[PDB]
């Protein structure tokens, strides 16, 4: 009698929100299966199982189909998602069906569904590209018995820690190859549990707020850089994928013109527009190209020197006399056209790079786009043409060649809150491991500029002004909040409507970057931002 070694799949780790609420869980699914070769009399066995597991003609049809679409010595499923009654009936009849096995498989389960689709992700059936990636990564040995894998979100990014260590058993088999006894068992080690910074309740609030809008929201804690909410709408049910997605259902998601499969928070690429002005302002002051007292008169436009090209301000007849404070408050364009000119693309792109623009944020998701912080070298490589001075001007107001993701907006916003201290936006709070608890470690990222300058305060005072002072663009949304809100809006290209904000202005506890594509399906981005900040601060 042969002794065989058989791998044992580990239990996939649990994912918990910041309050210990489990977000991704494991269900056991039971099925009976057989290798028809190993079964003496298949048709006899199938018919007797009509009585025992409520095997139907439909069940037999699918089995027979799957018997062909499968190779020799495959274990073909006979009946799936057995009820526990049916498993029990089979158990006490097991001795009558040599070669029919009853097996339990852990499937992943997402209790809160579409509220966490993009950030949590889903696990589903391994495919050949997954094999390739595992083989090329030298992980394939540890998947001998694993048939599903994280495909996006946290489930993918932390696949290695969530997966665990495969174990094995020595089992005795007789002739015809049927399992008699288990000799030895080296059990698997479960994946580590993962504790996230997300607040489930805030995430569901926001998803429900967004309704049928194409939108993205990133809520962070600036003290930590932890992501408290990361929502992209429209979403979808990740559970659809866990036990294989219907082609009808999957094609319904691909063909949706609202693109629910895109994670807009990390892959949505948009002109950041006037949201960038506080960081441009800090950069100009730091670079000495402006002072808190620098002023210019704005007639509603700005002409590039040595050229007839004029760049318009949103305000038709201008803002009159502007310093940096009033230009932030009123999202003046003309003032920042001038700052761009004086900085030059080289310094302006270098500074905005320090704010993270054009760079991956470091967030612990693998679905991300870097956007574009234009430079001379980039324009040369990308279009052959060299950089013209007029290309610099729209960069000053977050337009032109400039594109960013909402997660990049969140990272730059936090840098400003923390006076140049760079905190990576992350979802991981800690991993269980044993439980030998291991917290997430902020990678060494040098600060931006000079911590001990007053430029940071100046830019944030403008954002306070945006939200509170009567000339501020966002006064109608934020001025009446008990706690003090600071904010900065932008408009891209209907038109995408963007909003950054943090609260309370005193000691900020929350930072929010959000965007409603084409104004959203209902309210204004300013109203939704006030509701979110209200909900958080109550």
Close Cβ partners of 43 (under 8 Å, ≥ 6 residues apart):
none
Pair type for strands 428-431 and 194-196 = antiparallel
Close Cβ partners of 523 (under 8 Å, ≥ 6 residues apart):
none
- From 8, 55, 13, 48, select the one nearest 31 (Cα to Cα): 55
Q: Which of 232, 274, 286, 327 is catalytic?
A: 274
CA angle, 360 as apex, 354 and 362 as ends, to 5°?
Answer: 95
H helix or E strand, kind and range, residue 195: strand 194-196
Measure the CA–CA gap between 10 and 145, rounded to whole angstroms: 8
Measure the CA–CA gap between 54 and 75, rounded to whole angstroms: 20
Q: What's the gap between Cα 102 and its chain centre? A: 38
Residue 392: half-sphere exposure toward Cβ, Cα within 13 Å? 24
Q: Is 16 exposed, middle or buried (0-12, 13-18, 19+ CB in 10 A)?
A: buried
Question: CA 404 → CA 71, 206, 272, 321, distances in Å?
Answer: 49, 22, 6, 30
Measure the CA–CA gap between 284 and 205, rounded to whole angstroms: 38
CATH number for the domain harbouring residue 320: 3.40.710.10
Residues, the chain? 538
Measured from the Cβ of residue 176, the count of other Cβ atoms closer than 10 Å reads 12
H helix or E strand, kind and range, residue 3: strand 2-8
Tell me how far apart the terminal alpha carbons of the chain are, to the nearest angstrom. 70
11, 26 Cβ separation under 8 angstroms: yes
Q: Is the dihedral of CA 514, 517, 523, 525 positive or negative?
A: positive
3-state DSSP call for residue 360?
coil
Measured from the Cβ of residue 488, the count of other Cβ atoms closer than 10 Å reads 32
- From 458, 457, 459, 466, select the one nearest 485 (Cα to Cα): 466
Q: Is 209 exposed, middle or buried (0-12, 13-18, 19+ CB in 10 A)?
A: buried
455: containing domain: 200-537
503, 483 Cβ separation under 8 angstroms: yes
Measured from the Cβ of residue 403, the count of other Cβ atoms closer than 10 Å reads 22
φ/ψ region of 398 (left if φ > 0, alpha if ψ in -120 to 50, else beta) reads left
3-state DSSP call for residue 145?
coil
134, 64 Cβ separation under 8 angstroms: no
Pair type for strands 194-196 and 15-16 = parallel
Measure the CA–CA gap between 401 and 263, rounded to whole angstroms: 22
User: Catalytic annotation on 489?
Assistant: no
């Amino acid at each position: 009698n042969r002794i065989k070694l058989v791998p044992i799949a580990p239990s996939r780790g649990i994912i918990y929100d910041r309050n210990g609420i489990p977000l991704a869980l494991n269900r056991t699914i039971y099925q009976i299966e057989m290798m028809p070769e190993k079964v003496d009399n298949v048709q006899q066995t199938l018919d007797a199982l009509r009585s025992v597991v409520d095997l139907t003609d439909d069940d037999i049809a699918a089995f027979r189909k799957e018997r062909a679409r499968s190779h020799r010595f495959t274990s073909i499923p006979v009946k799936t998602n057995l009820t526990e009654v049916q498993v029990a009936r089979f158990a006490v009849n097991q001795y009558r069906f040599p070669g029919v096995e009853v097996k339990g498989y852990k499937r992943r389960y997402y209790p809160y569904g579409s509220a966490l689709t993009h950030v949590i992700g889903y696990v589903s059936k391994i495919n050949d590209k997954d094999v390739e990636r595992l083989n090329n990564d030298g992980k394939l040995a540890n998947y001998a018995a694993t048939h599903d894998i994280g495909k996006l979100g946290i489930e993918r990014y932390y696949e290695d820690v969530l997966h665990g260590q495969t174990g094995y058993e020595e089992v005795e088999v007789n002739n015809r190859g049927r399992v008699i006894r288990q000799l030895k068992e080296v059990p698997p080690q479960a994946g580590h549990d993962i504790y996230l910074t997300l607040d489930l309740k805030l995430q569901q609030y926001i998803e429900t707020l967004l309704a049928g809008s194409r939108a993205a929201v990133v809520v962070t804690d600036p003290r930590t850089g932890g992501v408290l909410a990361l929502v992209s709408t429209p979403s979808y049910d990740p559970n659809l994928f866990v036990d294989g997605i219907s082609s009808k259902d999957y094609s319904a998601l691909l063909n949706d013109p609202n693109t629910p499969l895109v994670n807009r928070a990390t892959q949505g690429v948009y002109p950041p527009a006037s949201t960038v002005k506080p960081y441009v302002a800090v950069s100009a002051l730091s670079a000495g190209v402006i002072t808190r007292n620098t002023t210019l008169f704005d007639p509603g436009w700005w002409q590039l020197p040595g050229s007839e090209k004029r760049y318009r301000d949103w305000k038709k007849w201008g803002h009159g006399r502007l310093n940096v404070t009033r230009s932030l408050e009123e999202s003046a364009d003309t003032f920042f056209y001038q700052v761009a000119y004086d900085m030059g693309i080289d310094r302006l792109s270098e500074w905005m790079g320090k704010f993270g623009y054009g760079h991956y944020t470091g967030i612990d998701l693998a679905e991300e786009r870097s956007g574009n912080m234009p430079t001379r070298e980039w324009k040369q490589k990308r279009f052959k043409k060299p950089w013209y001075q007029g290309d610099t001007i729209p960069v000053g107001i977050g337009q032109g060649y400039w594109t960013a993701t909402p997660i990049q907006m969140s990272k730059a916003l936090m840098i400003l809150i923390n006076d140049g201290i760079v905190k990576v936006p992350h979802l991981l709070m800690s991993t269980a491991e044993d439980g030998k608890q291991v917290p997430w470690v902020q990678p060494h990222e040098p600060p931006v500029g000079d911590i001990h300058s007053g430029y940071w305060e100046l830019a944030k005072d403008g954002m306070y002004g945006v939200a509170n002072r009567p000339n501020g663009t966002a006064h109608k949304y934020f001025a009446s909040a008990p706690y003090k809100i600071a904010a900065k809006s932008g408009t891209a290209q209907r038109d995408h409507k963007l909003m950054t904000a943090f609260a309370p202005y005193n000691n900020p506890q929350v930072a929010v970057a959000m965007i409603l594509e084409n104004g959203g399906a209902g309210p204004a981005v300013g109203t939704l931002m006030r509701q979110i900040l209200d909900h958080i601060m109550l």
